[PDB]
Scaffold this active site. Structure first.
Site, short mmCIF file in Angstrom:
data_model
loop_
_atom_site.label_atom_id
_atom_site.label_comp_id
_atom_site.label_asym_id
_atom_site.label_seq_id
_atom_site.Cartn_x
_atom_site.Cartn_y
_atom_site.Cartn_z
N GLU A 12 22.30 -2.91 41.48
CA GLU A 12 22.02 -2.83 39.89
C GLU A 12 21.44 -4.13 39.52
O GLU A 12 20.52 -3.99 38.76
CB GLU A 12 23.19 -2.24 39.42
CG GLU A 12 23.36 -0.78 39.62
CD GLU A 12 22.37 0.32 38.89
OE1 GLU A 12 21.54 -0.03 38.48
OE2 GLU A 12 22.30 1.38 39.62
N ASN A 32 14.24 0.73 29.79
CA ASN A 32 13.62 2.01 30.50
C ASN A 32 12.49 2.25 29.67
O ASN A 32 12.39 1.95 28.68
CB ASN A 32 14.91 2.97 30.39
CG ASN A 32 16.11 2.36 31.26
OD1 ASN A 32 15.58 1.81 32.31
ND2 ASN A 32 17.19 2.19 30.65
N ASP A 51 12.06 5.06 27.97
CA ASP A 51 12.48 5.77 26.92
C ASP A 51 13.01 4.71 25.70
O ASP A 51 13.39 5.43 24.71
CB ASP A 51 13.82 6.85 27.34
CG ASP A 51 15.26 6.19 27.53
OD1 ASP A 51 15.14 4.80 27.72
OD2 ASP A 51 15.95 6.85 27.40
N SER A 85 15.63 2.68 25.86
CA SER A 85 16.94 2.26 25.95
C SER A 85 16.90 1.21 26.92
O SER A 85 16.09 0.75 27.72
CB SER A 85 17.88 3.42 26.57
OG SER A 85 17.30 3.88 27.96
N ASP A 138 19.42 -1.38 30.10
CA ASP A 138 20.51 -1.40 31.04
C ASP A 138 20.92 -2.91 30.74
O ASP A 138 20.13 -3.83 31.04
CB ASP A 138 20.17 -1.07 32.40
CG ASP A 138 19.63 0.49 32.34
OD1 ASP A 138 19.95 1.28 31.73
OD2 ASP A 138 18.98 0.67 33.34
N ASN A 173 23.93 1.74 30.14
CA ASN A 173 22.89 2.09 29.46
C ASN A 173 23.00 2.29 28.08
O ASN A 173 24.04 2.85 27.69
CB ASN A 173 22.13 3.08 30.08
CG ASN A 173 20.81 3.58 29.57
OD1 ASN A 173 19.76 3.06 29.81
ND2 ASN A 173 20.69 4.52 28.54
#
Ligand SMILES: [Cl-]
Ligand SMILES: [Cl-]
Ligand SMILES: [Cl-]
Ligand SMILES: [Cl-]
Ligand SMILES: [Cl-]
Ligand SMILES: [Cl-]
Ligand SMILES: [Cl-]
Ligand code: NA
EC number: 3.2.1.17
Length: 129
Positions: free
Chosen positions: A35, A46, A48, A50, A52, A59
């Site tokens: 990750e 991301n 969309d 959002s 992380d 998220n």
């Protein structure tokens, strides 16, 4: 902070992640490696809108507030910047909520694709725990 493999294993063990909901410590170390490359400051945006955050790439759509993810939830009740701390406590406490949520560690796309069904014990081999 960029953690060493054993340093992180020891920190996660002290915070109660070894066998949390049946996931051996090696699963959590493997997920953190893929990750974030063990870097508490990692961010990734991301498609969309959002973002992380941190060592476990939590998220902003569901788990934390960053002030820029419209109609998002804040289920861990923390600012997303708390997840970038060198103290992994906020990340660990939030990860325990996530893995209890029904999908287990499948919530972490890198765990599903790169850790699941592999010899994860290899991630803690050699460590004084
Ligand atoms: Cl490594
Ligand atoms: Cl393990
Ligand atoms: Cl927001
Ligand atoms: Cl919320
Ligand atoms: Cl908050
Ligand atoms: Cl820590
Ligand atoms: Cl599970
Ligand atoms: Na949010």
């Amino acid at each position: 902070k960029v953690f060493g493999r054993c340093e992180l294993a020891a920190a996660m063990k002290r915070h109660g992640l070894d066998n949390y909901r049946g996931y051996s410590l090696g699963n959590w170390v493997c997920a953190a490696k893929f990750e974030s490359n063990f870097n508490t400051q990692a961010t990734n945006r991301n498609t969309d809108g959002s973002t992380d955050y941190g060592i476990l790439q939590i998220n902003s759509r569901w788990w934390c507030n960053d002030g820029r993810t419209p109609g998002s939830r804040n289920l861990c009740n923390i600012p997303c910047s708390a997840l970038l701390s060198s103290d992994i406590t906020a990340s660990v406490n939030c990860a325990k909520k996530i893995v209890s949520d029904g999908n287990g560690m499948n919530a972490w796309v890198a765990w599903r694709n790169r850790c699941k069904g592999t010899d994860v014990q290899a991630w803690i081999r050699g460590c004084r725990l």
